[PDB]
Amino acid sequence: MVDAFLGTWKLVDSKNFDDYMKSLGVGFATRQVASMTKPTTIIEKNGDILTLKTHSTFKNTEISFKLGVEFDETTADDRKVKSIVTLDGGKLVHLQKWDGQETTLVRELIDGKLILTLTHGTAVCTRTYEKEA
Numbered sequence: 001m002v003d004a005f006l007g008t009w010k011l012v013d014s015k016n017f018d019d020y021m022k023s024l025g026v027g028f029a030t031r032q033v034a035s036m037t038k039p040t041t042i043i044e045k046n047g048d049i050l051t052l053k054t055h056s057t058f059k060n061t062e063i064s065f066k067l068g069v070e071f072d073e074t075t076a077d078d079r080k081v082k083s084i085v086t087l088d089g090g091k092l093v094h095l096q097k098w099d100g101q102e103t104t105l106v107r108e109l110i111d112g113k114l115i116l117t118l119t120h121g122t123a124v125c126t127r128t129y130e131k132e133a
């Protein structure tokens with residue numbers, strides 16, 4: 001199921017991330033740092049539990065979850081959300097809900113690259129990761 005997503009991934013392309021951050025209300029000085037950061041994402045499984053780490057020179061996050069089971073999450077920008085991650089069409093779909101708002105973080109594999117599509121409001125950001133050995 002999820003096994004092609006597992007491993008260490010490095011950011012190699014980003015489109016419309018400023019739009020996405022601004023839609024979420026991230027302040028301009030933070031957006032400026034974030035626009036120049038290249039995170040590493042590490043996706044590990046242990047049985048039915050996935051752990052997704054995001055590491056950078058600015059902020060780090062880590063979440064653990066079972067597919068299809070809601071979990072509490074506090075995002076990098078300090079939103080307290082109700083989250084669920086599911087496999088849908090071969091994509092890892094992460095849905096966050098708070099205050100009646102929603103955002104999706106969708107990961108899919110295309111030609112061995114991991115494409116992360118972030119949608120909030122009308123903003124749609126595409127971030128591409130390449131696998132580390």
Ligand SMILES: O=C(O)C(F)(F)C(F)(F)C(F)(F)C(F)(F)C(F)(F)C(F)(F)F
Pocket residue numbers: 020021024026039041054075076077105116118127
């Ligand atoms: O993993 C990535 O590339 C990523 F930086 F885009 C990201 F998903 F972490 C993210 F979008 F920045 C995020 F941290 F999750 C965020 F949505 F919470 C926000 F910070 F942008 F507000």
Ligand SMILES: O=C(O)C(F)(F)C(F)(F)C(F)(F)C(F)(F)C(F)(F)C(F)(F)F
Pocket residue numbers: 021026030031033034037038039054055056058059060061076077078
């Ligand atoms: O700090 C915010 O609000 C932020 F959105 F800018 C941010 F830290 F989440 C980030 F820089 F966008 C981020 F990209 F998610 C990150 F730094 F966490 C990382 F993913 F780069 F690691």
